Scaffold this active site. Structure first.
Site, PDB file in Angstrom:
ATOM      1  N   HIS A  11       0.821  -1.225   0.000  1.00  0.00           N
ATOM      2  CA  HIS A  11       0.000   0.000   0.000  1.00  0.00           C
ATOM      3  C   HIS A  11       0.847   1.265   0.000  1.00  0.00           C
ATOM      4  CE1 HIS A  11      -3.958  -2.094   0.593  1.00  0.00           C
ATOM      5  NE2 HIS A  11      -3.054  -3.075   0.619  1.00  0.00           N
TER       6      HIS A  11
ATOM      7  N   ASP B 236       7.797   5.715  -0.654  1.00  0.00           N
ATOM      8  CA  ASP B 236       8.327   6.965  -0.087  1.00  0.00           C
ATOM      9  C   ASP B 236       7.904   7.201   1.333  1.00  0.00           C
ATOM     10  OD1 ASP B 236       5.623   7.414  -0.322  1.00  0.00           O
ATOM     11  OD2 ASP B 236       5.747   9.106  -1.750  1.00  0.00           O
TER      12      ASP B 236
ATOM     13  N   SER C 110      -0.285 -15.913   0.778  1.00  0.00           N
ATOM     14  CA  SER C 110       0.031 -17.145   1.425  1.00  0.00           C
ATOM     15  C   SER C 110       0.369 -16.871   2.893  1.00  0.00           C
ATOM     16  CB  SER C 110       1.330 -17.732   0.758  1.00  0.00           C
ATOM     17  OG  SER C 110       1.460 -19.064   1.232  1.00  0.00           O
TER      18      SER C 110
HETATM   19 CA   LIG Z   1       0.595 -20.271   3.336  1.00  0.00          CA
HETATM   20 CA   LIG Z   2       3.663   5.893  -0.931  1.00  0.00          CA
END
Ligand SMILES: [Ca+2]
Ligand SMILES: [Ca+2]
Ligand code: HEM
EC number: 1.11.1.14
Length: 349
Positions: free
Chosen positions: A52, A73, A182
């Site tokens: 994100h 950043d 996972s």
């Molecule tokens: Ca896994």
């Molecule tokens: Ca960023």
């Protein structure tokens, strides 16, 4: 960038003397953020945070005269009030608030800290690649715009176009970066229950995510019909609509299936794509390689096969989507179908 190979006070040699300070950061977060080096909730959240922070960059927007975000950043931490309010970033202010104090205390940039904590987090999960860590991200000066982080209800085309814009990644690479589900759970999609895992081994970096997303979905694990959620194949496991459709789309189905029973491709591809994510918005040749500070990853313990069908499932339950190669004939674990245990998050997730 002139690097000065050096022996740190702990006796370890690193590629550049500036890397030695990260051993103190490492010991602090292993004890005080990951509770003794665990691949639990905080580790998972830290891995999520890397994506994100990084994917919020858009050359297409910059071409239209608008700021498109600075990539990796640290903007999601610096401007948490703005970015964590965006719907795709739901639940991330909890991990940002837990990470903040370490940044202030150690005097490192927010962006380098996010990439560091993500790499250490993964090193705590058995089966993970040997992770890299490069330094050099200056603090963001503007928050990223919204509409840059994919949602679970976006179409396959939308997601393919988004990651192609952000970093020139193709559809194969999209599949690879989804390997991080996972070692992951979902706290905010089903409002009745937090911590539902994406695969039956959320503490192990393996290919169960790719096996289990290919099985026929038969039930919702908690409440039904939440936005971006589809039926899953096992009690306690959640499946989101984007993962379900990427696994079945003709462009990406054979790449998704290629990780089943192929540990070395899983590890090598993910090592590669994780590093790439952490360099978005940066010049790789201007960064310092401090990978020698990251701990060595551990192998998966025990003697079960690398990939397997969960108990109660066989090849008959697989929805074959890859036209070039038949799904591999795996063993089935013995006994009755068992529910996947939830991973409770810290308060506020
Ligand atoms: Ca896994
Ligand atoms: Ca960023
Ligand atoms: C490309 C499209 C992707 C979509 C649509 C997506 C979607 C989601 C969703 C809906 C959740 C649960 C969020 C919540 O309940 O708050 C989640 C969790 C997570 N995602 Fe993704 N994701 C994507 C890619 C990635 C990538 C590239 C990474 C790699 C770092 C990643 C890492 C994780 C992790 C580790 C979690 C678990 C969080 C936890 O356990 O708290 N995801 N993802």
């Amino acid at each position: 960038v002139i690097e000065k190979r050096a022996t740190c006070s702990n006796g370890k040699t690193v590629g550049d003397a500036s890397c030695c300070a990260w051993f103190d950061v490492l010991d602090d977060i292993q004890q005080n953020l990951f509770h003794g080096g665990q691949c639990g909730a905080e580790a998972h959240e830290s891995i999520r945070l890397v994506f994100h922070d990084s994917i919020a960059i858009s050359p297409a927007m910059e071409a239209q005269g608008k700021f498109g975000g600075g990539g990796a950043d640290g903007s999601i931490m610096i401007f948490d009030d703005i970015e964590t309010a965006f719907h795709p970033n739901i639940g991330l202010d909890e991990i940002v608030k837990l990470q903040k104090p370490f940044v202030q205390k150690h005097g490192v940039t927010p962006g380098d800290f996010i990439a560091f904590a993500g790499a250490v987090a993964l090193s705590n999960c058995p089966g993970a690649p040997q992770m890299n860590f490069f330094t050099g991200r200056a603090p963001a000066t503007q928050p990223a715009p919204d509409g840059l982080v994919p949602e679970p209800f976006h179409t396959v085309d939308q997601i393919i176009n988004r990651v192609n814009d952000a970093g020139e990644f193709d559809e194969l690479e999209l599949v690879w970066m989804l390997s991080a589900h996972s070692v992951a759970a979902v706290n905010d999609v089903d409002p009745t229950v937090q911590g539902l895992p994406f695969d039956s081994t959320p503490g192990i970096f393996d290919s169960q995510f790719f096996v289990e997303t290919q099985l026929r979905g038969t039930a919702f694990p908690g409440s039904g019909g939440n936005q971006g959620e589809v039926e899953s194949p096992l009690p306690g496991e959640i499946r989101i609509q984007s993962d379900h459709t990427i696994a079945r789309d003709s462009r990406t189905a054979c790449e998704w299936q290629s990780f089943v029973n192929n540990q070395s491709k899983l590890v090598d591809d993910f090592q590669f794509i994780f590093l790439a994510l952490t360099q978005l918005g940066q010049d790789p040749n201007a960064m310092t390689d401090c990978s020698d500070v990251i701990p060595q990853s551990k192998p998966i313990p025990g003697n079960l096969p690398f990939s397997f069908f969960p108990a109660g499932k066989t090849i008959k339950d697989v929805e074959q989507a890859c036209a070039e190669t038949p799904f591999p004939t795996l063993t089935t674990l013995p006994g009755p179908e068992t529910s996947v245990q939830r991973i409770p998050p810290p308060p506020g997730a």
